[PDB]
Amino acid sequence: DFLLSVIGFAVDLANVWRFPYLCYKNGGGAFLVPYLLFMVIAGMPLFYMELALGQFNREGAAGVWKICPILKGVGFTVILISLYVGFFYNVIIAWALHYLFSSFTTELPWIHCNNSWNSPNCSDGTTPAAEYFERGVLHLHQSHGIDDLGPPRWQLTACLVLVIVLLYFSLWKVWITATMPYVVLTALLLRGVTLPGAIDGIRAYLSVDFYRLCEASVWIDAATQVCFSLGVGFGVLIAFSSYNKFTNNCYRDAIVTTSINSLTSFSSGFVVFSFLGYMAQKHSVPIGDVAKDGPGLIFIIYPEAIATLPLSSAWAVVFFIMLLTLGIDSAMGGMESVITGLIDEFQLLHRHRELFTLFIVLATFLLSLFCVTNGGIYVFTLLDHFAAGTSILFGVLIEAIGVAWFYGVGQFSDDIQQMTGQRPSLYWRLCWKLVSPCFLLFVVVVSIVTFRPPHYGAYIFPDWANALGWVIATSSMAMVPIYAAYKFCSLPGSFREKLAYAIAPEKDRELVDRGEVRQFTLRHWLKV
Ligand SMILES: NCCc1ccc(O)c(O)c1
Ligand SMILES: [Cl-]
Ligand code: NA
Ligand code: NA
């Protein structure tokens, strides 16, 4: 089935690991409003556009730009973004595998403070779960900062090797993941709702304060989260649709995938806040002082409020199995996109697919070895801030501007009506033409203007770390102007001739040679 592949990749660890984190950081309802607004405004139109554009041209993440030859660097931008994201996406899978391996006993290791990895400041005041996660799994206490990393730990490197071997051996030439995560999530939700004290947690979840909406950070977080979770801006949807039947309904597929993604995120947040409220009632603390903010919320809160219920081992086992299955598919899809795009762009290493895949896998493993050191959480934070960031928004904005303005939203609608029996309505055309590009441009400009450098707890990153992060972002962002300059210089003729052959699709060549260019008039740009 084609739908099960799109659903499997779209729903990932971002629905269950990042959404509750950003909800707890920005309060209950101050994050749900911009998220839903940006979702309806841009996420669904971009998903539909990506599916249709991939299905029609049938060339891949970079070969679809025969409709605009000069804007072809955005095809390499998405490949670079996927490669960067893969450098830290697999470490979470390694952590989940480690927890699953260590959660097969009658005495869970995060129960009390009578172990060798504890400190005299254990609550049982720091809770034993956070102390375990930070001193027996990560060994964070043996590092001073990002300038003192230390050698890699051999315990997490084995899990990294296992994940890498699985990926390579499944990518050298879905049905299980279709149902199990949803069953586990529903069981967890049913268990969490009935726990005493969860009503206050859901009350905090469904309450919005109108002072955080006036700051230009919740909107950036919501836009970035929507783009990251949906999967737009990686080049995966284009490649997926390039292999699909011509007479296929991408409208229905986009609607269903978006609805499922939103429902999954909402359920994950509801469960997390119910557990937080239960823990807060169990102890004597406010909800906002239960755990510190960071990308360890689901590794600290879940074991803590799972170790109190009867049959905790089974709950832990199913939780970590669901975590593994929900992420292996997306980790596979990203590398599939990178490899297939790079092998279809350059038809010299085509039959040499085995060696190219081996090289890509080796590079991913070697460069992800940086996050398994003693101070690897700082590298993880830096990558999580600077890999998708404003680069993904810039790429999405460039793709939308290309497809709409430089090609014709009317021409796009005519192509869709040829591929199907219907013409997209005025809502979709208006969104694509005006609504998504304007909001994306505003968000990109605001994100550049306001920096807010990353941090972990009470640790402040130095200057060179921020410089390196900005270099990482600019490396993927700067693929468009370089290829534009190369393409303009490579073409022969005069400036007018070069522009005519650079901004026109590679199908109106006879019309251009006759001297008639549609892009050189005003009705082309004033058409909605
Ligand atoms: N939801 C993001 C899924 C994703 C995207 C790119 C990657 O390289 C990867 O490993 C995972
Ligand atoms: Cl999400
Ligand atoms: Na997935
Ligand atoms: Na997702």
Short mmCIF file of C-alpha atoms in Angstrom, two decimals, residues 5 26 47 76 89 164 174 196 210 222 233 236 245 284 291 327 332 391 418 457 523:
data_model
loop_
_atom_site.label_atom_id
_atom_site.label_comp_id
_atom_site.label_asym_id
_atom_site.label_seq_id
_atom_site.Cartn_x
_atom_site.Cartn_y
_atom_site.Cartn_z
CA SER A 5 4.38 4.16 3.64
CA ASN A 26 5.71 27.25 26.34
CA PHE A 47 1.99 18.54 1.81
CA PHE A 76 20.49 19.77 -2.95
CA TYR A 89 18.21 11.36 14.82
CA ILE A 164 23.37 1.36 11.67
CA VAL A 174 5.58 -0.90 7.65
CA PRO A 196 -5.69 10.37 40.38
CA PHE A 210 -2.37 35.60 26.24
CA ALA A 222 5.30 26.15 16.06
CA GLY A 233 11.49 20.20 3.32
CA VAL A 236 11.10 12.49 0.83
CA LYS A 245 0.61 5.54 -10.07
CA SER A 284 4.18 18.08 46.93
CA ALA A 291 11.03 18.46 35.89
CA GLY A 327 11.46 6.04 14.62
CA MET A 332 15.21 4.65 7.02
CA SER A 391 17.20 26.34 6.87
CA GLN A 418 -4.74 16.31 -16.29
CA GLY A 457 20.16 23.76 32.02
CA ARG A 523 -0.47 38.75 -16.62
#
